[PDB]
Design a protein around this ligand. Structure first.
Ligand SMILES: *[C@@H]1O[C@H](CO)[C@@H](O[C@@H]2O[C@H](CO)[C@@H](O[C@@H]3O[C@H](CO)[C@@H](O)[C@H](O[C@H]4O[C@H](CO)[C@@H](O)[C@H](O)[C@@H]4O[C@H]4O[C@H](CO)[C@@H](O)[C@H](O)[C@@H]4O)[C@@H]3O)[C@H](O)[C@H]2NC(C)=O)[C@H](O)[C@H]1NC(C)=O
Ligand SMILES: *[C@@H]1O[C@H](CO)[C@@H](O[C@@H]2O[C@H](CO)[C@@H](O)[C@H](O)[C@H]2NC(C)=O)[C@H](O)[C@H]1NC(C)=O
Ligand SMILES: Cc1ccc(-c2ccc(NC(=O)N3CCC4(CCO4)CC3)cc2)cc1
Ligand SMILES: *[C@@H]1O[C@H](CO)[C@@H](O)[C@H](O)[C@H]1NC(C)=O
Ligand SMILES: *[C@@H]1O[C@H](CO)[C@@H](O)[C@H](O)[C@H]1NC(C)=O
Ligand SMILES: *[C@@H]1O[C@H](CO)[C@@H](O)[C@H](O)[C@H]1NC(C)=O
Lengths: 125, 50, 96, 149, 106, 47
C-alpha cells in the first residue's frame, strides 16, 4: 500500500483544515490508519487513530475537542479534520497505516505500528 | 446513528460452571421424569424439587 | 396482500412487523414455503433457496419490531409472493 | 419439595390420588398421630458446625426457616380470612349454598371417586368466582337472621 | 501522561561503528514499542517493531532488545546513510494514547 | 479416524447479547485447548 497526501493549505486562526489521504494497492478496509503531525523543529506527534472495519476513532488528549478522523470506505480515503485552528498548529501533517490480517473475516489484530507512510502536507495557520 | 464505547481488555480465564435455579419461598419446581418426552404435552412421571 | 412494484432490475424492500417493538424471532418464506431469510435472536441467517444470495435485512431495526427482506440485483423471476412469520401474524406481500 | 411448608407438603403427596382417597388418607394419618402410633420426622438442616464452611448452612438454614415461617403465616391468615364465608378456623366447612347442576352435572360419587383435585378444580374453574360470591352472601344472610332473635 | 525521551540528544558516531540509541518511557511499554528512521524530506520509515522484530526490507544492521520502560536500538556497522533522527514510539495504551518521543540525532 | 475441523480464532464478534458488534483483544501466546462433550445438535429443515 501507498498513501497519497493532499495539497498544502494556508488558514487564519479560528478556521479549520481538512486533509485527505488516499490509500491504494490493497483493500482499504483491512488497513488501520493514524495521523501524525510534525511542526518544524519538533518531533513526531500522534494525533489520532481510526479503525476502518468498525467506524471508530480516538484522539490525543489535547485534540479531543478539535479533531475528527473519517474513513471514507467507498473512496478509500481518510480525512483528518482539525477545527478551532491556531497558529500553534502550523505543521506538516501526514497519514500512516498498517495491515490487519484478514480483518474482513474478523481477524483484526489492532496493530499499533506504522508501515505505510504518506509524504507530508504543509498546513500553515 | 450508533453508540460506541471502549473498555479496558484484561484477558480473563473463562471456564463455564454449572449454575442451578432455585424456587423462592412459596414456590416449587415441577420436573418431568419421563425417559421419552418431546418437549410438550402431558408428562406422566412428575416430581417436585426446589 | 401488500404489493410492491420495482423497476425489475434493481432492489426491493418488503416488510414484516411486530407490535412488541422488540427483536423477536422471525422468518421470510416464498410461496413454496422455502426459507429466504430469518433470524436467530441477534444473528441473521440465510435461507437455502434462489434468494440465498442477493439478500439481507436491517439488523439495527429489529429492536424496533421491523423485520425487512431486502432483495438486491432483482430480476423479474423473483416476482412471487412472500409470507411473514412474525408471532402468528402471517401476513402476505407480493414482489413485482 | 421445600418452600411450600409442612401444611402443604403433608397434603401434596395426594396430588395424584382421588378426592375421596385424599380425605381418607388425611383422616388415617391424623388417627395414627393422635394415638401415638407413628411419629413425624424432621427434615431440617443441621447448622454450620465448622466456621470456615458456615456460609453453606447459614444461607440455606435461614432460607429453610423463611419458607416455614411464611407457610405458617399463610396458613393462619387463610384460617381467619375464611370468616367471611363462615369457615374460619376450619379445614372442612359445609355451607348452605346448594350446588348448581349447571356448574357441574355430576353425582357426588362420580366426583369424589373417579377424579382427583387437580381435575376437579379445572372442570369448575369458570364458576369459582360465582360460587365464592354466593358463599359470602349466604354468610351475610345467616348473620342477619341470627341477630334478629 | 505518556512521553518518551532519548538518553543522547545527539549521538556522536562514525561510519563502521555500532551506534547505540536508548529510549525511556514515563509509562511501562512491555515490548509494545517501535523505532523509526527520519531523514530530511522523508517519511519516518519503520525499521523495528515489537520488542525488536525487523520489518521486511530492514538491513540486518538494525537490532535491539528491552523490557519494562527501557529499550535499546543498535545499528551494527553504521553506514553514512543511517545518520538520521531516530524516533521511539509507544502504543500500548487502550483507548490509544500513543506517542513518539523527542528522538535523537546521528 | 480423527475427523479434523479447521478452526480460526477471531477478534470481531457479532454479539449474541443483542444486535451489535464487538472487538476483543488479539490471541494469547501459548497453547490453548479444550476438550468438550457434544451432547446435542441444533438442526433445521426447509420446505
Ligand atoms: C467443557 O468442559 C471442559 C471441562 O471438563 C472445558 O475444558 C477446560 O477449558 C479451559 C479453558 O480453555 C482449560 O483451562 C486452562 O487450563 C490450562 C492448564 O494448564 C491453564 O494453564 C489455563 O490458564 C492459562 O490461560 C488463561 C486464559 O486462557 C489465563 O488467564 C491463565 O492465567 C493462564 O495463562 C498463562 O499461562 C499460559 C500457559 O503457560 C500462557 O499461555 C499465558 O500466556 C499466560 O502466561 C486455563 O486454566 C481447562 O484445562 C479445560 N479442562 C479440561 C479437563 O480439559 C471446556 O472448555 C468446556 N467447553 C466449553 C465450550 O465451554
Ligand atoms: C419417576 O422418576 C423417578 C426419578 O428418576 C424414578 O425413581 C428413581 O429410580 C431409580 C432406579 O431406576 C433409583 O435409583 C432412584 O433413587 C429413584 N429416585 C427417586 C426420587 O425415587 C421413578 O421410578 C419414576 N417412576 C415412573 C413410574 O416412571
Ligand atoms: C404450620 C402448619 C399448620 C397446620 C398443619 C396441618 C396438619 C394436618 C391437618 N389435618 C387435616 O387436614 N385433616 C382432614 C380433616 C380431618 C378428618 C376429620 O378431620 C382431620 C385430618 C391440618 C393442618 C401443618 C402445618
Ligand atoms: C343455577 O343457575 C340458574 C341461573 O342460570 C338459577 O336460576 C338456579 O336457581 C341456580 N341453581 C342453584 C342450585 O344455584
Ligand atoms: C487420533 O489422536 C490420538 C491422540 O489424541 C492418536 O493416538 C490416534 O492414533 C489418532 N488417530 C489417527 C487415525 O491418527
Ligand atoms: C464427558 O462424559 C464422560 C462420561 O462418559 C465424563 O467422564 C467427562 O467428564 C465428560 N466431559 C465433559 C466436558 O463434560
Amino acid at each position: 500500500v501507498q498513501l497519497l497526501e493532499s495539497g498544502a493549505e494556508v488558514k487564519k486562526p479560528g478556521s479549520s483544515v481538512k486533509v485527505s489521504c488516499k490509500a491504494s494497492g490493497d483493500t482499504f478496509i483491512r488497513y488501520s490508519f493514524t495521523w501524525v503531525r510534525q511542526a518544524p523543529g519538533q518531533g513526531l506527534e500522534w494525533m489520532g487513530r481510526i479503525i476502518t472495519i468498525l467506524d471508530v476513532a480516538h484522539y490525543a488528549p489535547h485534540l479531543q475537542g478539535r479533531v475528527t478522523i473519517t474513513a471514507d470506505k467507498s473512496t478509500s480515503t481518510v480525512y483528518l479534520e482539525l477545527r478551532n485552528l491556531r497558529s500553534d498548529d502550523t505543521a506538516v501533517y501526514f497519514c500512516a497505516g498498517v495491515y490487519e490480517g484478514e480483518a474482513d473475516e474478523g481477524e483484526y489484530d489492532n496493530n499499533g505500528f506504522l508501515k505505510h507512510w504518506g509524504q507530508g502536507t504543509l498546513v500553515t495557520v | 446513528n450508533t453508540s460506541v464505547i471502549t473498555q479496558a481488555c484484561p484477558k480473563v480465564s473463562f471456564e463455564p460452571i454449572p449454575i442451578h435455579y432455585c424456587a423462592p419461598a412459596g414456590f416449587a419446581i415441577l420436573k418431568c421424569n419421563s425417559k421419552t418426552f418431546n418437549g410438550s404435552g402431558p408428562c406422566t412421571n412428575v416430581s417436585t424439587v426446589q | 396482500k401488500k404489493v410492491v412494484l420495482g423497476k425489475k432490475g434493481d432492489t426491493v424492500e418488503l416488510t414484516c412487523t411486530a407490535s412488541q417493538k422488540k427483536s423477536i424471532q422471525f422468518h421470510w418464506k416464498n410461496s413454496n414455503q422455502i426459507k429466504i431469510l430469518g433470524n436467530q435472536g441477534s444473528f441473521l441467517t440465510k435461507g437455502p433457496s434462489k434468494l440465498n444470495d442477493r439478500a439481507d435485512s436491517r439488523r439495527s431495526l429489529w429492536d424496533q419490531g421491523n423485520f425487512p427482506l431486502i432483495i438486491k440485483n432483482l430480476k423479474i423471476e423473483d416476482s412471487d409472493t412472500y409470507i411473514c412469520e412474525v408471532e402468528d401474524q402471517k401476513e402476505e406481500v407480493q414482489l413485482l | 419439595a421445600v418452600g411450600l411448608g409442612a401444611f402443604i407438603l403433608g397434603f401434596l403427596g395426594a396430588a395424584g390420588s382421588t378426592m375421596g382417597a385424599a380425605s381418607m388418607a388425611l383422616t388415617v394419618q391424623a388417627r395414627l398421630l393422635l394415638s401415638g402410633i407413628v411419629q413425624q420426622q424432621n427434615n431440617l438442616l443441621r447448622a454450620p458446625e465448622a466456621q470456615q464452611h458456615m456460609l453453606q448452612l447459614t444461607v440455606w438454614g435461614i432460607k429453610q426457616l423463611q419458607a416455614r415461617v411464611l407457610a405458617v403465616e399463610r396458613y393462619l391468615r387463610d384460617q381467619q380470612l375464611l370468616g367471611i364465608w363462615g369457615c374460619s378456623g376450619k379445614i372442612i366447612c359445609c355451607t348452605n349454598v346448594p350446588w348448581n347442576d349447571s356448574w357441574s352435572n355430576k353425582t357426588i360419587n362420580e366426583i369424589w371417586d373417579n377424579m382427583t383435585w387437580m381435575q376437579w378444580e379445572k372442570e369448575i374453574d369458570n364458576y369459582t368466582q360465582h360460587i365464592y360470591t354466593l358463599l359470602e352472601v349466604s354468610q351475610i344472610q345467616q348473620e342477619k337472621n341470627e341477630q334478629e332473635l | 501522561e505518556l512521553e518518551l525521551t532519548q538518553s543522547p540528544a545527539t549521538l556522536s558516531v562514525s561510519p563502521g561503528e555500532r551506534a547505540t540509541l536508548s529510549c525511556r518511557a514515563s509509562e511501562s511499554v512491555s515490548s509494545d514499542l517501535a523505532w523509526y528512521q527520519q531523514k530530511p524530506g522523508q517519511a519516518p520509515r519503520l525499521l523495528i517493531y515489537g520488542a525488536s522484530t525487523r520489518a521486511t526490507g530492514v538491513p540486518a544492521r538494525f537490532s535491539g532488545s528491552g523490557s519494562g520502560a527501557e529499550f535499546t536500538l543498535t545499528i551494527s556497522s553504521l553506514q553514512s546513510e543511517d545518520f538520521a533522527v531516530y524516533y521511539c514510539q509507544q502504543y500500548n495504551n487502550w483507548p490509544p494514547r500513543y506517542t513518539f518521543g523527542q528522538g535523537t540525532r546521528l | 479416524q480423527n475427523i479434523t475441523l479447521q478452526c480460526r480464532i477471531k477478534q470481531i464478534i457479532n454479539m449474541w447479547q443483542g444486535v451489535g458488534k464487538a472487538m476483543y483483544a488479539p490471541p494469547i501466546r501459548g497453547q490453548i485447548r479444550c476438550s468438550s462433550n457434544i451432547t446435542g445438535l441444533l438442526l433445521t429443515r426447509d420446505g
